[model samples]
Target chain A: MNTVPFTSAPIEVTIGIDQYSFNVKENQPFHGIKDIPIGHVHVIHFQHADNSSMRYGYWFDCRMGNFYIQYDPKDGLYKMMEERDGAKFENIVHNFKERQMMVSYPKIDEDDTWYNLTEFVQMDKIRKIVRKDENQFSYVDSSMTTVQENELSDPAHSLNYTVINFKSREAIRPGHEMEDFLDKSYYLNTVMLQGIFKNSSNYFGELQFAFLNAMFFGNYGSSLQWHAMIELICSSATVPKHMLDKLDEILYYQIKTLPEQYSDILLNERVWNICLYSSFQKNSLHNTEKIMENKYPELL
Target chain B: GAMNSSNYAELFNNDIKLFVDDTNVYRVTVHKTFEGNVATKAINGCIFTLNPKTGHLFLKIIHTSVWAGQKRLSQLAKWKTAEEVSALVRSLPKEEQPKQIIVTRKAMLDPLEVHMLDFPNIAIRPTELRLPFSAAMSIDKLSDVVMKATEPQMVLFNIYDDWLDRISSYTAFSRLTLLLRALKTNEESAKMILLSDPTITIKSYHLWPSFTDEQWITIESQMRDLILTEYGRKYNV
Candidate 1:
């Protein structure tokens, strides 16, 4: 999942017929970022072939600006894809054999390769944070099979709706189902955004997918703090800067070369950061009740 | 238990074969894949890797029905700003100060171009290459428009900014081969190519997917005779 900076001369090209024209000077290391770290911007345009009256389509922002970046069609994102099959997180890019020229990043020079990653705890400890739903709690059993699948339900599902902090281990609860407040109208839209995340094939994708399912799905807000949580994971925690460090930790399980203990360690923290910003855990949802009942049987 | 060659051929529908022994074979479904424009050959059971240079030559030849793990490559061009349509108009009289221009946003991120740009597995940088296209038209036009303003080739031009590089220009063999392929792919368009390279001019009338056997025999004879005259002793001709 590591991505290096694009060091070659920028590709400049044109499209369109009459007076109106579309041109691009591709020089960015990551999509949509005009500046460093926090500055996010990505625009994708849908087009039709010439013989067909394929009038041009609209340009979309990859991030959850008004909507999140799930994806592309007859995609250009491959030109920016990290050279790994793990990037295929969703259907659009999974079997895609885009005739559009695809590109992989250049190898980062020693001077450029900076940042070291940290050691992370086990998956059980991480799962303990969000196993609020009865099915979630039931699924957390002795069987390793269900645990390994690691499927998360839709945003409105109780499991996705609640989250806990990685560092403080504090947890928090949301009001009603997310549909009550968050804009669940375009729920299907996440599919497109997932494609974009898959296309990102690097930390930008992980970090966004992390916070999106956290902040955007679980708790949509206008608070400056909501945006700040994203900034901290991307900038302060240093995952984006150290993307290539523990490449396996951020990747999906199948293509993983690392042990399961280290899996999703950094990516989990990105989700937990949403809980970190809000702050509370045990009492909020009685999540730790059974576990604590076993730990301290004196209460029983 | 023993298996026969026919049993195995029927097993995987004959797409794959590993001639392990005489009568028996190993036929398997392809489930694994790595990256790049992979070209698998007859030795299916063994590990394989395409020679970078050899693959580059083949990459230029896109199959008619393309899709990968590939399909058609197209670019998106839209009016950059419907209002900023100021200075970039098709120029006319001096009276209009050309305050508006249709700044169309266009870019090509085709799999073909980027595969050529792949570092460590780079394709021969540009115009030194010949694109013997054989796709059914949007792609033929798309590919041409694409190659004309591509990167890896453009990037090579930048790398060799000075005069210290291999000589350029297409050769006669390559030029004729391109004609033959074009005649096979797009019959009328072959005549269009004849306008430039008048020798062995081509235009075709064809309903058949396969070309004349003699035409192919002629192609092989050309290869065999040319090889014989040039390096006859090398291969014990």
Candidate 2:
């Protein structure tokens, strides 16, 4: 019997969808964020007579949103599926083929990837002294260090830096199950709201972005913080101010990559003050967990 | 080896017997699964069954739709808001959002769409790709739905974003083929059963179920071609 290997190496193939294929170095943080690692890409094969190749692979990058690519090689479409004989992959591929297109052959070399990921960790030394709570931890001013792919000592093994000081204010009893409190109902209706407003795809307008900025800066109370931050940073003259230029840079990348489906998510040109506010507010960064829990308790 | 006690004992009949006339024989059964427009909306499922020996049609239910995994897919796509999805479903037309899984002898019966909600393989989550939680649920649901059946003759599913019609027929075809390759297997029990009636196993993704009469051909001929192809043959016969 020819058994499949536990893990497979990445198939170096031509990925054609857009002009440039998105590339990520192993063990690197997806964006500039530390701890958040790039997971393996999953491929879905679509077969079409109209298609140049009978099969094309849809590579979904783990960290980024619905990143899909299409191309065909001898292995055809399914060079990326984890288990071909299983459920969703099987049903969809069958339907694709029934229409005169067939996609299968899911292969994955599992030994190489980390299934779960940690995104960020923030320390507040001042908060520890101010809050005066015995249980509170301290933070020290520090520069953000991004973990690039090549920097990882062992790409395949787990990294300690990726895991960190995650503390929960509310704890379940030893016997209680996580599912009891964190059921599907909680996930869909509320926990989702925590990330939904700031998520890349919020269909609402700048109000959503404004809310995320506010939360990011730990200024939940100040509605005008958006204005104050801008006034302090925005400058005019021969060259664009450093703050405004930086804001434009971020927006350029957002529009270039974000799906056209989320057209409303981009920041407006009139929002110079709002951008300034956001820039200044980044100095008051708070633990994401604290913000997430305070703003959205349903997840807790 | 236990002739007296097969799980299929309840489905067996005394008159049905096997003979080696050796003239290339096949037992035939005819089945139709239909859902007109209303009750099928309730469960969104269709039922068809065949027998083991004569391959005679033992059961058929058309027009009764017990909602299948696709509904889960649509909901996950956020096509309808969490609250609005239920109402949209209630108002859908029978001919339009038919949302029924049509199983036939052909492994390739319809274009199957695999979405996050309808995918299988629950132990691992696929949401790492920045996909919504729905993707994970949809796939897991699809797995449970297919695995629950007595190993279907052929099952097809389609994943749509907003409306089912919006999906191109070509895109649908190619995607389903990939899924079939992943799920196809060579084990005795893993082989897709050819209609519940005749119970003989057909190993390939090819080979349509045998039918006794032409009028009962209830399904479109395209379905016949898909299953027949698995046998490395054509349905022109």
Candidate 3:
């Protein structure tokens, strides 16, 4: 077996030029805070650290308009987010599930001042310029904030790596907006799930893993419990009969394919186990009923 | 599937009244919206075309707006208020309502092309042209100007400020990321440049890649505000 080092590959093309050159006023940047141009452009050359091959990554500045939060060394939660690492992938799954849930229903953290939405508009301007020319869209990154640098580099820590980007801005701003989008996104995902499980009562856990992929940018990595819940609720879904039947088949196909796709990573195990346990114990197939009950107990 | 072929008869009798005469060149001058700001832009001429098939509206700023301080008696639109959009919607014939309307700011870095009335110019769609549809103007001073327009769109700001003002706000964040993503995905060629440096700053915009998602959302909102206000007015009942 042969193993080589990681080197960046050819990532993107270049549509290089500044958008604010001619229109800048003499006293603009130096004076007004609100008067800054949305953003600018720069080309990145992703060459191997060993100078082997060259790939390019484009960088766009998407900064928050407000202040952000940081991990206070004095706080326990901050310490946990930075120091806790028990099981190899279990921690991540726990973190992911919690984060995913947060993404599902974000709370209004005190960090609201830092979570801004101006970056999208700035990106839109760039979109027009790029759209005029024929180009495909690729990955995007927001401005990064540094948190737990030494912890990030610890070998026992999976994140134990090389030098990280310096902390220019705030790091741990509560991810509220993403939470908001996911909240709505989950509702839609739930709608899709309930529609699918109207047929056979089996394979409830399988459908959730598949559904996770359909909703997000990444692939399937859900717990069995989530999958089971999806399948169970769907069994008694209130959607149209035809739509429900279609969902059932679609979910079944995805569920059938899961064992081949995922061998049994902790992320998969956690997701799978949770969904199964919750369904049998809590009888979570009636999750919609539970959700409604939690929302308005008198309605039932 | 929403549109039927028979619905193609829509533009047949509809009078969009676009200006496309080869001999006639149109210029839109923008001025600063401030009380005493005397900046006047004498950009080159413009031309418009209505695509019969797609029902698309096409505009060409044949000449880029020149940073001249002289006030030309150019015929420009005035900003439309809430009442104005309602009035305009009411005034339009029911048949003219189906066409998809899009407005944008001219890509300052667009390439020069033939059949284009304005060279070294940029064109914006209807939605992005916010300031032009909402600002007050000083048009009563000139009556001798050559009027090429049959019907003018609503105005919002002084043409100079609306059309030629410098870029600011968090709005340009997406545009910068867009260009980067375009390059990363190998969507466009290496040498292609869409917006000029004058329209937006390249160096400063690159910093956006370092921003957290939370921050980007802030900037996205500000940019969308202009779009919502400008484009939002056009669609209201």
Candidate 4:
């Protein structure tokens, strides 16, 4: 073995001229907190102590929104969230047993539309930009009373992380809105009865598996990737024959735990939208007599 | 099997060992133990290791591919990256050099003589499926995934802030230590770069939430007020 020291590597790849030179890398240092463009294809550029640079690039296939969390002692909890946002932190429910959460939207009666789904709106901005990018989300910092926002501003209080639902979901009809779809009950049932959840004994843990899959491979969209995710989640889970027989009891149990406001449309920032819609399903796949008894009365 | 990437690459992040390489690239050992703790395994994650001699950049990819789990060891050559993570490192003159800032229960500085028992274990997956899913959006906004997966380890802050944001909760002390352990920086550094700022005194884990298996004695006075959960509420008919 021999000994040597660390020396910085300067990077290069060129395009454009004096007037045409355009590397995203050049403006990177001050890019700030802008969300990465969905379906983003980009690179990394860094400057070392001696002014030399080291870098790398990635071709991210993310079709959905990526996320991050910020802490603001001042912004604690819903202080940053607005009324029109799709999912309310108050309405968000947690299933610690399943290592998951349920974020509901106000019922998608004809007018609620896709506007409430902030994550979707934000994502539309991203997709159109790339065209392009929670809570399950909010925190009320502990030192609220002890300090004033301006005077003893808790460093923890300055976290500027937005209150945006930072995930993505496409509208029921992109560039359009339609009511032929069922909202929460439909999606929750789809996860349970359709492809993946049907195979997993209606377990939400596998949703974690699928969520993990989505976050990793960047496939939370509503097409082939979503269809394939149906497969990826199914194989990861084993069937529970006993649990299968009691679908009615379980379906009622799973769908009800979610908060009151619900939707299969109007994407918003919440952990629950981890599941998505697809061009593949018209909900005509199953409506056998018994299926209607359990899912059709709307279980209101 | 004597430890290869496949069997143990759950990307569960069982335990992480952080350090900057001699070439100034970010390198972390993501550790995982076999089913019953029979063996401990690791995937050496080198963040866009720019081969000083070859000048070829390699990225160590970590993602849970399978349902149970698996990770990919990927590389991104010449063609390149987060806050811009590259920017964080660029701002600090001190971050230009390589250093080890592993915040373990007990510090094990030397890799050669280090034993597996020296560090603690992280249960990324809930056992009996038991674990804390307690913190959500309160913590969700802290993700540094793009910064970790895409950004190069050009500066120490990239590695430093990545894990801090990954396991940002003070209550999840052990996981926090693992975040601290894999870094070449300090908690104070984490606040400054992570936020726009911490006195280490206020950063103590005991000050946060913790519940005993017995479910008695709560350090967090405002637990219910802050961390809203349905755990205690009975399902209404």
Q: Per-prediction TM-score, please?
A: 0.19, 0.18, 0.16, 0.16
lDDT of 1: 0.24
Better of 3 and 4 by lDDT: 3
lDDT by residue for model 1 over A1-300, one digit each (tens)?
211122221333332211123443444222221111112222222122222222221112223122212223354321222223333323223222132222332224452211111122122322332343322111111112111123312222222211212111021012211121122212112221232223223323333223222221122221122233333332222232233233323322211222234323322343334322332221221222333233322322
What is the two-chain DockQ of model 1? 0.00
User: Highest TM-score: which candidate?
Assistant: 1
Write the residue-wise lDDT of candidate 3 on A122-230 in tens digits.
3333333223222222121111111223333322311111111111111111222222121222322343333432232223223332233222212222232334334
Q: What shift in Å separates residue A227 of candidate 1 from its native position after superposition?
A: 28
Which candidate's lDDT is highest? 3
Tell me how each candidate scores on DockQ against the true complex.
0.00, 0.01, 0.00, 0.01
Please rank every candidate by lDDT, starting with the best.
3, 2, 1, 4
What is the docking quality class of candidate 2? incorrect
Worst 10 residues of 3 chain A by lDDT: A1-10
Candidate 3 runs further than 4 Å off: A1-190, A196-300, B1-94, B103-131, B137-237
DockQ, candidate 3, comes to 0.00
lDDT of each: 0.24, 0.26, 0.27, 0.24
- What tens-digit string does per-residue lDDT give for candidate 1 at B56-171? 11112222122223211121011111101111111224442222111111121121122212122212111222233222121233234333532211110011111112222222
| Ten-residue stretch with the least lDDT total in model 4 chain A | A1-10
